Amino acid sequence: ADQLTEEQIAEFKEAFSLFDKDGDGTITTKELGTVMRSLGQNPTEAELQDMINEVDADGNGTIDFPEFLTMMARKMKDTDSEEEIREAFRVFDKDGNGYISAAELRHVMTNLGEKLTDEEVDEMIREADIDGDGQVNYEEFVQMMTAK
């Protein structure tokens, strides 16, 4: 009847790939919890399996597009948010100054991803900056998607 849009859904098709460790196309308690702590948390398997069991179709410990769509789509269905931008920024930078240096970005990137090099990160960061300072700033992220 109604599902996420090209932009929303898009981030979803991509998420399922970033969430999991290898990109099985589904999120589990092992993957969910992993990323959770990868940022700055420390939940138990109970909250991971419980939360997933409440959204998982078959309740086997992993979510699928069909059950995830209606869940995230029914609760969410809009572009980025001021909270997400700032929040994500608080978790990226170790000092929360707003500037994400490759050291930090690569750290989180490889944490959720597989393996990232100093060149790839600096290449992705420097190429991201507007004026190029070696790191990424809030104004950079916003300008990156929106702003001018």
């Binding site: 970033l18 969910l32 939940p43 869940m71 969410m76 994500a88 992705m124 990156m144």
Partner: peptide, 28 residues
């Protein structure tokens, strides 16, 4: 659009907000 290749961090924070919101609670 200051530079090229922005979709990256975009999906990055999106995953951060959706994972933190989904995993825990409180939509948006």
């Amino acid at each position: 659009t200051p530079r090229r290749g922005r979709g990256g961090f975009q999906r990055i924070v999106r995953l951060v907000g959706v994972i933190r919101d989904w995993a825990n609670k409180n939509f948006r």
